[PDB]
Design a binder for this molecule. Structure first.
Ligand code: ANP
Ligand code: ANP
Ligand code: MG
Ligand code: MG
Lengths: 343, 7, 333
DNA sequence: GCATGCATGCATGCAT
DNA sequence: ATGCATGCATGCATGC
């Protein structure tokens, strides 16, 4: 429908903020969001949710959107059930660490449920972890891992969140030379099992090593593929054109170029990823606002486009990931013959 | 060769 | 205009003191000074200012001049509010143990920020840390590190210094464990964010590895390369010759020695560093005054010049630092 | 065997 | 007479 004309009366910061807050609900995003929401609505004896998408596809934005949706849905019940907390999302390693430190993960998870009215709980069962009636929850550095793990388990059971979110979970594979991938997944499964809280794992195609390592984790896991748009499928091309036209209409500038016709160039420099294209357009708009120009030129797009080498590397990475995730009827027949009564 | 004022 | 001619009748101590006080504003120093002041005037969201350079270029002199000029600027605003502290600066302490001691650094930062008008913030939430029976602050030994860090944060936010200077910040790199190196800088960053005070770090090329452990550090900080004068480019050679001419004209001696023609030897020993050149010339002038000589000969320069091995090691270190700073980030913007 | 720094608990001196 | 605050002794926790 186009951005409102009142934005042009505002300086560059407000226009860029409006463009950043603007979101497009493309059909693939809508389908994946619906699937994930329905999966959260009924875990059905599953402790893991594996959502893997390429870089700049919209996994994080999907996480915030779904978190806000569960918060809004639970609020009417949360008026009377004030003790409950519907969602909680943390990163695996917030400040980069060459290694994943379990203890750091549990400390972050436990501190990421704080509320100003901490009277709901009164206790975690472990010394050195209670706060002095403050919104800031303090964890003593000398507390051993199993005890504060017990505290986190008790907090998760009492608070009863609907789903635990682990964004950018590709960092779980950054083991401190232990090479204990199955042990790490077993620890996470045990946590989910004694806590009864559904765990959602979000990350790139790197975590496919986490996918089917063991049968127990295979049954406990639910696989969701955040598919990108590919130029092979005509409907994907049409959706990409629709996203391009919507972003062209909603970017706050006096005039906009016919960037829809350049869809081949955009797909080449974005690999059909909504998040990457949005970041590219945000960079272009930031450059234009720095220039305070009223138009976008082809050179504006080409200045802050993705490098050729980066596109080549990510294309191969994504194609390999999709081939790994690809399924064929041949596999179904092989499995049926292995079980028996093949046809 | 330009003389420099004290810093 | 040269040195005052009246100083020739003054004793040798006065002439030596005058030469020591005299400073040269060579173009690289002026550029670095202006960049540092403009960065101080507007934080631009950067909590750190890194100014690294070869040893003996004048980082300490730059810091001192910045502190003096900032005090001069802040005096009219200090007239109204006496509680505000314009600038706090303190050299980093090289620890005798492998691990850096943050407790001693915090205590010394509190001592540096000491204000004679103690009545403004006489209580930081401390256990007797405030001064008693003497002007200096008496830090209680048994005070734990987190509490004293909280007291330091309270004092910093109460005084709100314009900029915080940490001289010789390369001592922060001194840590017991290799993987533990990542923690000191983020602790200092968290302290800066909690206080909101602009921190500036000065040091040699040793901190370059400590500087760029991640791209976030580059994003959240401003880099200032105190470049030396390189004989490769004729412009730096001309600047070095002009600096030598100025030192020649300002050196308190009866006859001005022709130091310009020996510029190759000076670059051989000073390696394009103005501070080392000033130290060498001060030593030579001291010997001249003690001998009560009238001119400077090449033997005088050779007697007090740095050894060839010292120069080789210094050149190797500075060349390695320059090559490591030649790192490039060619990627999508 | 030990060193060395830090935290805690108890004893005691002082002030109200 | 008693409560509070600080100084000292000892354990401890890690390192050598
Ligand atoms: N639906 C959307 N509408 C508009 N902008 C979007 C949308 N999804 C993503 N973006 C933009 O793309 C950015 C990155 O999206 P994000 O959700 O981090 O993608 P990702 O595939 O999870 N990337 P990674 O950090 O590699 O996992 C966002 O911060 C937005 O600027
Ligand atoms: N540009 C200059 N003009 C005049 N004198 C200078 C200049 N730079 C340095 N000096 C003098 O030389 C001395 C030594 O220089 P200094 O500023 O200590 O070097 P530095 O590079 O900071 N040394 P360090 O940081 O310990 O490796 C100063 O204290 C001044 O006395
Ligand atoms: Mg993401
Ligand atoms: Mg110095």
């Amino acid at each position: 429908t186009g951005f409102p004309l009142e934005l042009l009366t505002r300086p560059a910061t407000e226009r860029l903020a409006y463009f950043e807050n603007y979101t497009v609900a493309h059909p693939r995003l809508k389908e994946v969001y619906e699937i994930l929401m329905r999966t959260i609505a009924e875990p059905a004896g599953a402790s893991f949710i594996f959502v893997y998408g390429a870089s700049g596809v919209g996994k994080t934005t999907l996480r915030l959107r779904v978190e806000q949706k569960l918060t809004e849905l639970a609020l009417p019940k949360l008026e009377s059930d004030r003790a409950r907390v519907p969602v909680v999302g943390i990163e695996a390693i917030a400040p980069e660490s060459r290694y994943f430190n379990w203890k750091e993960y549990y400390t972050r998870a436990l501190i990421t449920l704080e509320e100003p009215l901490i009277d709901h709980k009164f206790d975690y069962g472990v010394r050195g972890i209670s706060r002095d009636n403050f919104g800031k929850i303090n964890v003593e550095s000398k507390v051993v891992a199993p005890a504060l793990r017990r505290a986190l388990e008790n907090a998760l059971i009492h608070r009863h969140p609907d789903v635990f979110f682990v964004d950018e979970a590709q960092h779980f594979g950054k083991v401190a030379s232990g090479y204990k991938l199955q042990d790490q997944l077993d620890c996470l499964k045990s946590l989910a099992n004694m806590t009864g809280i559904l765990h959602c794992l979000l990350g790139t195609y790197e975590l496919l090593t986490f996918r089917n390592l063991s049968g127990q984790l295979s049954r406990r896991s639910v696989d969701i593929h955040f598919r990108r748009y590919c130029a092979d499928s005509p409907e994907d091309v049409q959706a990409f054109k629709s996203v391009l036209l919507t972003f062209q209409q909603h970017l706050p500038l006096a005039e906009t170029p016919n960037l829809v016709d350049h869809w081949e160039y955009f797909y080449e420099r974005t690999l059909g990823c909504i998040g990457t294209l949005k970041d590219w357009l945000k960079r272009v708009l930031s450059d234009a606002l720095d220039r305070e120009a009223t138009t976008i030129t082809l050179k504006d797009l080409q200045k802050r486009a993705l490098s050729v080498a980066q596109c080549q590397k990510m294309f191969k990475e994504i194609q390999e990931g999709e081939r790994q995730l690809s399924e064929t009827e041949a596999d179904v027949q092989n499995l049926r013959s292995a079980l028996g009564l093949g046809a | 060769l330009v003389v420099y004022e004290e810093f």
